[PDB]
Amino acid sequence: MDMASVTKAMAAPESGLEVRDRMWLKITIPNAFLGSDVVDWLYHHVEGFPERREARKYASGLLKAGLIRHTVNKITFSEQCYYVFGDLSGPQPPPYHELEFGGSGGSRNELFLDVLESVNLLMSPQGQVLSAHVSGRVVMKSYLSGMPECKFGMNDIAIDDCTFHQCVRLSKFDSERSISFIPPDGEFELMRYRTTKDIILPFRVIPLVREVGRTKLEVKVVIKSNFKPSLLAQKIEVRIPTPLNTSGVQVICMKGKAKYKASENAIVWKIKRMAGMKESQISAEIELLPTNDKKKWARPPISMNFEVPFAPSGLKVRYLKVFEPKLNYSDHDVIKWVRYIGRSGIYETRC
């Protein structure tokens, strides 16, 4: 078989080879294994080897091959030192520097993690959630020098299905709650996913519409923010659909502002931002012209758009270890920035 495929074998988290985070000096090497266990698993599970003296000659081949990188700069293949995988899957710009007072600040090495989810709901008049699911994706801007091996980890959250950027090693997710990989430079979609269980619904809408004769139609809708009081959801928009026979509409709201764009047959309520665990109300009286043969219909659900600074799925980033074998830097030298941006898609409540 080919060398690449062989290593890829040890790769599977279930394979024989033990691979765990080891700690040397102050540093902490991510997903590393002993050079011995490699020669072991090499012959024990890899056939075509006469003696263990041949299983080691091969291992030395993988080191020169690159499929296996030396934790700390060393040319000869030792067996009593740790190792980390290379690029098992299928350009040098000038670096930055810390600004000093006439001085050479250490090279720049930071990364950005963006968790972008979109919540979609279809709640019933009384709260009975009907539709519900979150479509998310984790994007990453990499500004790391060389080819540092990284280990991304989060909580575990019943994730449904998902894809992963090629550079992602074969990482079990039900037991690891962490995947490994060699980050391509620049920005890329580390992974994608979609969940439906245990989703956090930012807002809850309590719609109340009453009929008073024909000309009168009362409306009182209240929204309840649902999340830590410390977090503020901004760019909020509520869309309440008015009948077609609308003659005149009067609105009242203590917070934000709300207009009645008839050109769209709906009242638009815009709220600068709103804290957690809080309620807000908007009420309005709708005038109706006697309905002389109106189209066939039922009240379009009340849509809602927003943006909350957290992961509507419950996903939270626990850590992103970075380690460069060739160069000297370890996590301690890397600046890590995260940011959750949960937006809203089809978020409607049955009128």
Swiss-Prot record:
Residues 108-350 form the MHD domain. One of its GO terms (cellular component) is AP-2 adaptor complex. It is found in: Cell membrane; Membrane, Coated pit. Transmembrane segments: none annotated. GO terms for molecular function: clathrin adaptor activity; disordered domain specific binding; lipid binding; low-density lipoprotein particle receptor binding; signal sequence binding; transmembrane transporter binding. The keyword Transmembrane does not apply. Its main location: membrane. Changing residue 114 to A: Abolishes interaction with TTGN1 and EGFR. The keyword Protein transport applies. GO terms for biological process: clathrin-dependent endocytosis; intracellular protein transport; negative regulation of protein localization to plasma membrane; positive regulation of receptor internalization; positive regulation of synaptic vesicle endocytosis; postsynaptic neurotransmitter receptor internalization; protein-containing complex assembly; receptor internalization. Keywords: Cell membrane, Coated pit, Endocytosis, Lipid-binding, Membrane, Phosphoprotein, Protein transport, Transport. Disulfide bonds: none annotated. It is a peripheral membrane protein. Detected in brain. A 1,2-diacyl-sn-glycero-3-phospho-(1D-myo-inositol-3,4,5-trisphosphate) binds at residues 257, 261, 270. Belongs to the adaptor complexes medium subunit family. Adaptor protein complex 2 (AP-2) is a heterotetramer composed of two large adaptins (alpha-type subunit AP2A1 or AP2A2 and beta-type subunit AP2B1), a medium adaptin (mu-type subunit AP2M1) and a small adaptin (sigma-type subunit AP2S1). Interacts with ATP6V1H and MEGF10. Interacts with EGFR and TTGN1. Interacts with F2R. Interacts with PIP5K1C; tyrosine phosphorylation of PIP5K1C weakens the interaction. Interacts with KIAA0319; required for clathrin-mediated endocytosis of KIAA0319. Interacts with DVL2 (via DEP domain). Component of the adaptor protein complex 2 (AP-2). Adaptor protein complexes function in protein transport via transport vesicles in different membrane traffic pathways. Adaptor protein complexes are vesicle coat components and appear to be involved in cargo selection and vesicle formation. AP-2 is involved in clathrin-dependent endocytosis in which cargo proteins are incorporated into vesicles surrounded by clathrin (clathrin-coated vesicles, CCVs) which are destined for fusion with the early endosome. This is AP-2 complex subunit mu. It comes from Rattus norvegicus (Rat). The lineage of its organism: Eukaryota, Metazoa, Chordata, Craniata, Vertebrata. The gene is Ap2m1.
